[PDB]
Write a protein that binds this ligand. Structure first.
Ligand SMILES: Cc1[nH]c(/C=C2\C(=O)N=C3CC=C(C(=O)N[C@H](C)c4ccc(F)cc4)C=C32)c(C)c1NC(=O)c1ccoc1
Length: 503
């Protein structure tokens, strides 16, 4: 439901309005041709015009397909790629990959196949585009078009930019709403943080902390921040909309009182990726419990409620006793200097509680006091049943290790150590991260699974930053606002908005 005059709102500005952007934009190689979604498409579209650069883009696309291809079908896809791109007489022959590297893969495919067979060649291709083909695209109309999109991205975001519909859930310092961008129509989840509730409770640094962490991290398994604006009496965070309910609901209301091992395996594999992306920013979540694992419309999961997340300084440990009863690692209950370990303890609580149907330290029918639940986390060894395969028992007790020094994933290797666990012996992570594995449960669409100080003005400056770059560009692509607006002159000629002669 895009606005009536959305083409006027997203109307491209004349390229002369983008001179300040031309020189302030860092021209990093693939910060503009890969990371930034629209930038990637425009550079790709720049190569579509050239005959030589054409075949280099088609090759990379074919390599991406090989990485997710099933195992028994690798040797097949492998041959197709070489006979199409690496044969010297091909119509789409790759040249900048030296003959001393096409004969290399000749030996790779002569043996068993590995999903990273063409990795050597792919890097060689990018290394070529990084040079002349990139600097050419910089002086091309597509980069001028890229600046036009950036101009729109940076525009101020206010309240008329959106269209709240209902209040879906309420929590601390505010509540959550269902927000919609008018010009694009995309549905988001607004987070109305009441302004006078923050200053009273003196939690201004905790609000910023979550807002900075959310914008810095993007992922398919953690709620993303697309906008952050200030308003009268409230401060808003525009986050991903999750209509599939939480994992607590599906474990106890719509299961056994639990899941099958294979079903829990899926959700676990996605949660692990969600934690890996948060650790790439050396950020610890510390709030891993079933009601915080939400499901989207397709059946996939994301982590939410990062209010307790904090960015750990590299080589430094934090101290704090936060979390929810039962889901606090022993090192957190002890109030010690810990790192990212509490999340792997939480992941152990999650996998266990999904398969068995109860907390590993409190029965579903047991009524115990906070003190006793805590003693078991520190003094009691969990017990397993015939619902856990020998691989499912191992990962849970390894992740539920009391001593965070011998806990899985808490080594220099990180989350990579967990993915290699036999419990994920049947999980292809490259295909999961690509969204190619069908979720085990698909939520139904109609389902309903449920004062004037100046210092206050200074705190707003760092919060109300505006639209987040990557989520914003994707929104333009999702809503097909890019497909419609990204139009040029007929027969590869400059359009009016990109002609410095007549504005
Ligand atoms: C669609 C939808 N999203 C959400 C919710 C979210 C979302 O989507 N993304 C995110 C990201 C982060 C949070 C988050 O920080 N939370 C904590 C607890 C919080 C903190 C401060 C507050 F002030 C309020 C809450 C929530 C969400 C909810 C409920 C529905 N409602 C249903 O799913 C539904 C429909 C019928 O029945 C139930």
């Amino acid at each position: 439901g895009k606005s009536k005059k959305w083409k006027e709102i997203l109307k491209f500005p004349h390229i002369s309005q983008c001179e300040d952007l031309r020189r302030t934009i860092d021209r990093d190689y693939c910060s503009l041709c890969d990371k930034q979604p629209i930038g990637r498409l425009l550079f790709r579209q720049f190569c579509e015009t050239r005959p030589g650069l054409e075949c280099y883009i088609q090759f990379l696309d074919s390599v991406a397909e090989y990485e997710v291809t099933p195992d028994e079908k690798l040797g097949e896809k492998g041959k197709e790629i070489m006979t199409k791109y690496l044969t010297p007489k091909s119509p789409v022959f790759i040249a900048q990959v030296g003959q001393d590297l096409v004969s290399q893969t000749e030996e790779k495919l002569l043996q068993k196949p590995c999903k990273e067979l063409f990795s050597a060649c792919a890097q060689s291709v990018h290394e070529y585009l990084r040079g002349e083909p990139f600097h050419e695209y910089l002086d091309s109309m597509f980069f001028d078009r890229f600046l036009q999109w950036k101009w729109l991205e940076r525009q101020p975001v206010t309240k008329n930019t959106f269209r709240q519909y209902r209040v879906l859930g309420k929590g601390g310092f505010g509540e959550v709403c269902a927000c919609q961008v008018r010009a694009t129509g995309k549905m988001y989840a607004c987070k109305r943080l009441e302004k006078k509730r923050i200053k009273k409770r003196k939690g201004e640094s905790m609000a910023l902390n979550e807002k900075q962490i959310l914008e810095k991290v993007n992922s398919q398994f953690v709620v993303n921040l697309a906008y952050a604006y200030e308003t009268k009496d409230a401060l808003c965070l525009v986050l991903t909309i999750m209509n599939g309910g939480d994992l607590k609901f599906h474990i106890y209301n719509m299961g056994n009182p639990g899941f099958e091992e294979e079903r829990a395996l899926f959700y676990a594999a996605e949660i692990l990726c969600g934690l890996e992306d948060l650790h790439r920013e050396n950020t610890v979540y510390r709030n891993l419990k079933p009601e915080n694992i939400l499901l989207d419309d397709y059946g996939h999961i994301r982590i939410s409620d990062l209010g307790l997340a904090v960015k750990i300084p590299e080589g430094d440990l934090i101290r704090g006793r936060v979390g929810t009863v039962g889901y606090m690692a022993p090192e957190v209950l002890n109030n010690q200097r810990y790192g990212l370990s509490p999340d792997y303890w939480g992941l152990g609580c999650l996998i266990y509680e999904m398969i068995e149907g109860q907390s590993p330290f409190r029965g579903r029918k047991e009524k115990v006091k906070r003190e006793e639940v805590d003693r078991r986390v520190l003094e009691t060894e969990e017990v397993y049943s015939h619902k856990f395969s020998e691989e499912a028992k191992s990962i849970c007790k390894m992740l539920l290790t009391k001593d965070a020094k011998q806990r899985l994933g808490c080594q220099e290797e990180g989350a990579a150590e967990v993915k290699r666990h036999p419990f994920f012996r049947n999980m292809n992570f490259k295909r999961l991260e690509a969204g190619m594995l069908d979720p085990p449960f698909v939520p139904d669409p109609r389902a309903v699974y449920c004062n004037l100080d100046h210092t206050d003005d200074d705190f707003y400056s760092k919060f109300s930053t505006g639209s987040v770059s990557i989520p914003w560009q994707n929104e333009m692509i999702e809503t097909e606002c890019f497909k419609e607006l990204n139009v040029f002159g007929p027969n590869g000629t400059l359009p009016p908005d990109l002609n410095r002669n007549h504005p």
